[PDB]
């Protein structure tokens, strides 16, 4: 004895990035990896005069990885791998909430959502050489445009665990990024050196629409 | 008869009252 | 693990 029900409610998504930098063993002129890493965030906002607490996990896929070769001497500046996101790539945002509307996202008929767009811009990162002038990687920007939503549940032995996923499409914007003291020719994208530019969070606001099968 | 080629199973666009399905 | 992708009122399932 079941029934279908509709929920039209607002949503705010607050998230941020993370990274991982490592160096290679030796005299100290060569870097090994400048890559991305997932990040978590916890916050509290109000809809309809009621406080809700939510959580967010941000990851990435489809990543373009670059390189630079300064020479073969022991004192040459070599970056073995740094990676950007540009125009053929996706960024993934998980989301779950404290409301009574997420108690009914078990058996879902349909789900759609209208969201704003946000721009993520880059910062700066000094490559610290022990002798000589330091190079620096600076710039970059992309914009995030929405895509579909995915619900996935996982059947282990103990208890079911499910998660909800927002997908986003990218489009490159200005300014370009550059590395100094080298020959990299002013490319586009958002690298993983200083991705969230000293800010506390990014923010996307919108509204969704959920139809689900509930007991009666 | 009608748009999207599905059409009482409900009142949505994609329900039978077929392009995708069995 | 069962996932479902919602594109234009049609479920796109995978196992």
């Amino acid at each position: 004895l079941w029934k279908e029900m509709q929920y039209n409610r607002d949503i705010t998504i607050r998230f941020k990035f993370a990274n991982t930098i490592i160096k290679s063993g030796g005299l100290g002129y060569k870097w090994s990896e400048i890559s991305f890493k997932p990040a978590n965030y916890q916050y509290t906002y109000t809809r309809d005069g009621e406080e809700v607490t939510a959580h967010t996990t941000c990851s990435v896929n489809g990543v373009n990885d670059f390189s630079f070769n300064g020479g073969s001497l022991p004192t040459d500046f070599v970056v073995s791998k740094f990676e950007v996101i540009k125009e053929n790539s996706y960024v993934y945002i998980d989301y779950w909430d404290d409301s009574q509307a997420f108690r009914n996202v078990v058996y879902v008929r349909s789900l759609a959502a209208n969201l704003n767009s946000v721009m993520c811009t880059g910062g700066s990162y000094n490559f610290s050489l022990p002798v000589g002038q330091w190079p620096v990687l600076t710039g970059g920007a992309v914009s995030l445009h929405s895509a579909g939503v995915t619900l996935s549940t996982q059947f282990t032995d103990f208890v079911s665990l499910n998660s909800l996923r927002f997908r986003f499409r990218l489009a490159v914007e200005e300014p370009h990024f550059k590395l100094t003291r080298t020959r990299l020719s002013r490319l586009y994208g958002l690298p993983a050196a200083n991705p969230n530019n000293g800010k506390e969070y990014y923010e996307i606001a919108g509204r969704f629409s959920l139809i689900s099968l509930v007991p009666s | 008869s009608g748009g999207l080629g599905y059409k009482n199973g409900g009142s949505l666009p994609t329900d039978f009252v077929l392009p995708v399905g069995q | 693990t069962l996932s479902t992708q919602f594109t234009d009122f049609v479920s796109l399932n995978s196992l």
Partner: antibody
Amino acid sequence: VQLKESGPGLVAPSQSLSITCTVSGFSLSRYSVHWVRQPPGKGLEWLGMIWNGGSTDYNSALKSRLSISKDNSQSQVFLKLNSLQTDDAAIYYCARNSGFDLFDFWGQGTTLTV
Amino acid sequence: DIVMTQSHKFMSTSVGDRVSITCKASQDVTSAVAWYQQKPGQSPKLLISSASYRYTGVPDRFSGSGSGTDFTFTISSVQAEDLAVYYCQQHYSTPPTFGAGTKLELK
């Protein structure tokens, strides 16, 4: 891409109202349509919105009067508003949603005399 | 139901000059304000989608800036075609709320 309004133009108080917004150049199963109005000497006000699938969001003050529905085969969206008074005299528009609430393309607009 | 208030109702300018139009929001709207243009005998048209992002088919002399509660709108050079009334919108919460309206006058 165009939007075209049509209505009576003149009506007695405490009566009904029926306006049809005929769309062209896009489909009503991929985009969503707004309704707004502007009284004489007033700013623009928001009335309603119908989603891609048939589902509506309404204004809180005018919730118990109006209803929005659409036809997908013959591409049109119609509006109804009953128990009208001398305050409801305005020019009604129909617009298309682009992002969250950005009003991208606009209609020609019909006026209502009471 | 965020109230969006505009301070002035009329502006005056020469055949080439800079124009400044502002409006304030009641609560904190994180950089989500649109701008519109309705010429007489016409329908409105969207110009600036976000707080600073221009639209595709817009002349270059239009620009916008501001965040938080204060939001401004500027024009670099005036024309004879630029006589209209201008509006600022709020697209952060559930009812979208327009402003009062500021009319430009040719002097």
